[PDB]
Design a protein around this ligand. Structure first.
Ligand SMILES: *[C@@H]1O[C@H](CO)[C@@H](O[C@@H]2O[C@H](CO)[C@@H](O[C@H]3O[C@H](CO[C@H]4O[C@H](CO)[C@@H](O)[C@H](O)[C@@H]4O)[C@@H](O)[C@H](O)[C@@H]3O)[C@H](O)[C@H]2NC(C)=O)[C@H](O[C@H]2O[C@@H](C)[C@@H](O)[C@@H](O)[C@@H]2O)[C@H]1NC(C)=O
Ligand SMILES: Cc1cc2nc3c(=O)[nH]c(=O)nc-3n(C[C@H](O)[C@H](O)[C@H](O)COP(=O)(O)OP(=O)(O)OC[C@H]3O[C@@H](n4cnc5c(N)ncnc54)[C@H](O)[C@@H]3O)c2cc1C
Ligand SMILES: *[C@@H]1O[C@H](CO)[C@@H](O[C@@H]2O[C@H](CO)[C@@H](O)[C@H](O)[C@H]2NC(C)=O)[C@H](O[C@@H]2O[C@@H](C)[C@@H](O)[C@@H](O)[C@@H]2O)[C@H]1NC(C)=O
Ligand SMILES: *[C@@H]1O[C@H](CO)[C@@H](O)[C@H](O)[C@H]1NC(C)=O
Ligand SMILES: *[C@@H]1O[C@H](CO)[C@@H](O)[C@H](O)[C@H]1NC(C)=O
Length: 521
């Protein structure tokens, strides 16, 4: 774990605006997307080789509010002008959502919750994991940007509610995703300063690592040397001037553009379903049927209570983990400008007093959809995405169980002081939005509640799966010198909160690449 300190911007010494980067560069590795996985991957590779990271967004310094916990809601409330760190989008399902667009990626705009992946998911992932390396990597990340949180009144109230409601056992303070209640780590330090993936760039070699911001990567370049191989990428700067960055012998292009950005770039580059690409007149580099397929978004269902007595805003630290659903509570200040993506749509009531958001995330999820291009040529145009929430009934059964558990929390002695009226069961609270069915045994009513009140937990993943598009070493099958490392590689979520796993993944693969280069020297 790390110790509270200012956000470390030492890496600015090797950060450049794309307009300032050479028109044609040569490196050992080119990383597309300076995000959650991309940054630690880049830093790791730079320990020995020349690396260039290309990020479409700005430096975190351009948007000060992404640097503090009290800025979380603010970023979501800001209008999307195409340059802001929070990019808005709506799934085909009709659910509002957001993704990061800034150096550090989505780890720069998230809720800060940090957890290590469920230790039981590595065996069936399709990857032969080196567990000693996995833990060493978690430690590497944690010693730089993860903190043991301060005690917080509302989080403590939530902890008492979970324990009263049977979410056992109690793990005390622990980073591990395990059934029961615990206080986990956070990327926000004890002074409220946000730490993120960008700071992991400081772990790289300042003479080998170069970062380009405001760099929109539009296409991967290929050649037969002799076999199909990725040779570089084309990116554009704010002046509209296109640049090219190539990789040298044994080097590689690694796409870490995220669940949404990676499949989009692959499709735009001619790697995807042959009939789909041809229909849009995109030359086919390699037929890859699963690019953009298997897009998963864990559903979030919730209850907002408006206490008669004000509660203080807090950062999420207490987690109530069940096998089929994960829960927590967030307390915040009132507002008249809605944080996009918080509620599923714009027509939702606004809180004029402090409130508590009890959220429930369904495990998996088993349901999935796909990603398709909205523009066949412009990478700045958001792709179309559909998640098909609750299309798999097992997800729905888990939502029902999850919301019943929330009902239990609402019926605890712990939450009584927050009701406006002392009514039986879950009744008596001042609710903002859709309330739970009164009858806690009415399954059909809970299914309707789950379907009509659903929102995104913002932990979408998939779209470029290991075993479908990638192999066990994260290489895009059939293409040399090309890998994918980010949240797009697996169908199920690694824990209640995935950033820890994706941060680890970046360096993990980086180390695997270095070990591979060592053997071939
Ligand atoms: C990689 O890192 C993992 C954690 O992220 C390791 O794991 C943890 O390893 C701990 C031993 O080093 C193991 O023991 C600890 O917990 C014991 C019981 O914990 C549970 O029950 C307690 C009360 O019943 C409760 O308070 C607690 O919150 C837990 O619910 C305790 O008896 C021990 O004194 C010790 O404190 C952890 O349980 C374990 N946690 C997880 C998430 O699995 C992992 O190491 C483990 O790998 C296994 C494959 C196995 O070999 C096991 O023996 C080993 O400890 C690390 N792996 C590597 C390769 O280093
Ligand atoms: C509002 C919100 C709250 C969340 N809360 C939490 C939490 O508390 N804890 C947790 O564990 N997880 C949380 N998550 C989820 C977690 O943050 C994400 O799953 C994780 O950051 C995704 O990592 P990634 O590397 O795949 O993608 P990203 O970090 O998004 O990185 C991809 C990067 O690629 C860039 N990019 C995309 N396309 C291009 C292109 N063509 N050219 C150049 N650059 C490009 C993007 O701008 C971005 O910086 C939250 C997510 C959101 C949106
Ligand atoms: C919802 O998710 C389930 C778990 O992934 C699906 O069932 C699983 O389907 C696998 C191949 O389709 C099969 O190997 C697994 O054994 C099976 N697991 C279970 C718990 O049965 C389920 O798929 C449907 O139901 C199963 C039983 C089969 O009849 C499939 O043909 C069905 O498609 C998923 N349901 C949906 C709506 O996709
Ligand atoms: C951890 O993962 C295993 C294997 O996928 C699963 O059986 C178990 O339910 C998970 N535990 C939790 C608490 O999510
Ligand atoms: C303020 O919140 C209360 C619930 O506490 C609600 O009844 C009222 O309508 C809200 N005021 C406005 C004008 O939205």
């Amino acid at each position: 774990l790390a110790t509270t300190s200012d956000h470390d911007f030492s890496y600015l010494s090797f950060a450049y605006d794309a307009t300032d980067l050479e028109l044609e560069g040569s490196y050992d590795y080119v990383i597309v997307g300076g995000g959650t996985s991309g940054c630690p991957l880049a830093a790791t590779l730079s320990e020995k080789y020349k690396v260039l990271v290309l990020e479409r967004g700005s430096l975190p310094t351009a948007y000060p509010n992404v640097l503090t916990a009290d800025g979380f809601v603010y970023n979501l409330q800001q209008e999307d002008d195409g340059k802001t760190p929070v990019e808005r989008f709506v799934s085909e399902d009709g659910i509002d959502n957001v993704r990061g667009r800034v150096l550090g990626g989505t780890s720069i705009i998230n809720a800060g919750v940090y957890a290590r992946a469920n230790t039981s998911i590595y065996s069936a992932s399709g990857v032969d994991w080196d567990m000693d390396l996995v833990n060493q990597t978690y430690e590497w990340v944690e010693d730089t940007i993860v903190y043991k949180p301060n005690s917080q009144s509302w989080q403590s109230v939530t902890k008492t509610a979970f324990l009263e409601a049977g979410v056992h056992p109690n793990h005390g303070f622990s980073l591990d995703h395990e059934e029961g209640t615990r206080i986990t780590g956070s990327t926000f330090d004890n002074k409220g300063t946000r730490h993120a993936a960008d700071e992991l760039l400081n772990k790289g070699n300042s003479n080998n690592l170069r970062v380009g911001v405001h760099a929109s990567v539009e296409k991967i370049i290929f050649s037969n040397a002799p076999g199909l191989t990725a040779t570089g990428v084309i990116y554009r700067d704010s002046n509209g001037t296109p640049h090219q960055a190539f990789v040298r012998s044994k080097g590689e292009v690694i796409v870490s553009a995220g669940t949404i950005g990676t499949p989009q770039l692959l499709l735009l580059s001619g790697v995807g379903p042959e009939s789909y690409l041809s229909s849009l007149n995109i030359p086919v580099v390699l037929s890859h049927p699963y690019v953009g397929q298997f897009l998963h978004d864990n559903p979030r269902n919730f209850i907002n209570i408006l206490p008669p007595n004000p509660i203080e805003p807090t950062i999420v630290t207490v987690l109530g983990i069940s096998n089929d659903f994960y829960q927590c509570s967030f307390s915040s200040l009132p507002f008249t400008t809605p944080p996009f993506g918080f509620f599923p749509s714009s027509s939702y009531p606004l809180p004029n007093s402090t409130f508590a958001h009890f959220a429930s995330k369904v495990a998996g999820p088993l349901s999935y959809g796909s990603l398709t291009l909205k523009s066949s040529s412009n990478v700045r145009v958001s792709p179309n995405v559909k998640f098909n929430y609750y299309s798999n009934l097992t997800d729905l059964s888990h939502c029902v169980s999850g919301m019943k558990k929330i009902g239990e929390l609402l019926s605890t002695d712990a939450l009584k002081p927050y009701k406006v009226e002392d009514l039986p069961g879950v009744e008596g609270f001042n609710i903002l939005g859709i309330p739970l069915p009164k009858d806690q045994t009415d399954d059909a009513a809970f299914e309707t509640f789950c379907r009509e009140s659903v929102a995104s937990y913002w932990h979408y993943h998939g779209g470029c799966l290991v075993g479908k598009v990638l192999d066990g070493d994260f290489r895009v099958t059939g293409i040399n010198a090309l890998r994918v490392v980010d949240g797009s590689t697996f169908p199920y979520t690694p824990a209640s909160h995935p950033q820890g796993f994706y941060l680890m993944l970046g360096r993990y693969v980086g180390i695997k690449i270095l070990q591979e280069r060592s053997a071939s020297d």
